[PDB]
Design a protein around this ligand. Structure first.
Ligand SMILES: N[C@@H](CCC(=O)N[C@@H](CS)C(=O)NCC(=O)O)C(=O)O
Ligand SMILES: N[C@@H](CCC(=O)N[C@@H](CS)C(=O)NCC(=O)O)C(=O)O
Lengths: 220, 220
């Protein structure tokens, strides 16, 4: 039976789980949290170990914590490397992706007075810290994939971040030719291609009225 | 050969790696970052994939990202559950530990005007969200360990957080008798006992002059 994704109708912290399950060719369904009363039903059901989402129902568990869900999907569907040494590289790479993701993820709820400086810090970190590091990985081995010459979650998570970087400012990708080639190849895996095509589960970026909706339901 | 831990002489993000390696009975050494020039040497050496610490040299890798290092230690030393289903529970539990840890970890750099409210939010989340959740896990199975009736990193990470909670306010543990019993049993594993005893690698809590030292080296 298909996993069931419980979240808001939006990217938030569920978006990387959509990408990873899509890349694994796993068909899923979503129950959207449309109102406060929807969130309150999940809590009063005892479905949420920490009273939070994302929550995914898979293989008879109600899994919360984005990283717990991702770790379980990657391992079940052979996207977590061949051995614990490849896993160490994959984790080091995707934890770097996660830190830059987090800065972009919190932009919409940044006091608008400190938003410019926060956008400058993101552009600086993208061009001077993260993307040069992943570019050097691809430069060092010349293979099509970040780890083990084989598709992993690291490729999937990095390519999702490269799309977010391009949405923020396309010039940020200009000096990273190997990352652009990675983004083109991963986008063309049959599973990911359907995910990005019209009718795919890929969520649109927020607007100011969409962040408003999420700020009254979770109230953060 | 023993792993080499690169960090500041303090808890920060390296403290859970000290606990986990100690619990596994793995002897380690530390190279402390005492000055800006120490941090600059690690960066200019190309040792830090993302120009950050923690960094651990283990089995011929220079691993950065706290979670990558932890994941690799837990898996190598049999503290990550017997199967990917136990791993899903362990990850869900320790990601909840990580969120409450993070709130306590950022207290020292909280604008003092918003610190009281942030301390209230931590006490509220500790007593109403996190500790009731882990108490219920122990209540549901009556076993000595959180997962699989066997020592895992989940026990180690939760017991480190229970000590941090007790340092902040000992009354927070009052209504959690099973968590107190867990803390007493895990504290008495021979490896963890040496870690907590005088001469152990366990780091003291910060003071106002210690956070000052770290704020000029990393400048955050
Ligand atoms: N560390 C968690 C974070 C979960 C989280 O922050 N969820 C938010 C929505 S994005 C939430 O449920 N907020 C409601 C609350 O905390 O009361 C994860 O990675 O899954
Ligand atoms: N997500 C990383 C965070 C690493 C981190 O924030 N390190 C800080 C010190 S605690 C640092 O090196 N700051 C220097 C900088 O970012 O320039 C992890 O979990 O290891």
């Amino acid at each position: 039976v298909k996993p069931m994704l419980h979240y808001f109708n939006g990217r938030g912290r569920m978006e990387p789980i959509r990408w990873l399950l899509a890349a694994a060719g796993v068909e899923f369904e979503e129950t959207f949290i449309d109102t406060p009363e929807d969130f309150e039903k999940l809590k009063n059901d005892g479905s949420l170990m920490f009273q939070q989402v994302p929550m995914v129902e898979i293989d008879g568990m109600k899994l919360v914590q984005s990283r717990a869900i991702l770790n379980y999907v990657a391992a079940k569907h052979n996207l977590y490397g061949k051995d614990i040494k490849e896993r160490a590289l994959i984790d080091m790479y995707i934890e770097g992706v996660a830190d830059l993701n987090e800065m972009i993820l919190l932009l919409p709820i940044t006091p608008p007075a400190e938003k410019d400086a926060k956008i400058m810090l993101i552009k600086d970190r993208t061009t001077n810290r993260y993307l040069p590091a992943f570019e050097k990985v691809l430069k060092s081995h010349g293979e099509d994939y970040l780890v083990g010459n084989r598709l992993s979650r690291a490729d999937i998570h990095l390519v999702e971040l490269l799309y977010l970087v391009e949405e923020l400012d396309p010039s940020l990708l200009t000096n990273f030719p190997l990352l652009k080639a990675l983004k083109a190849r991963i986008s063309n895996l049959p599973t990911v291609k359907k995910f990005l095509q019209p009718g795919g589960a890929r969520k649109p970026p927020g607007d100011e009225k969409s962040v408003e909706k999420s700020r009254k339901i979770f109230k953060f």
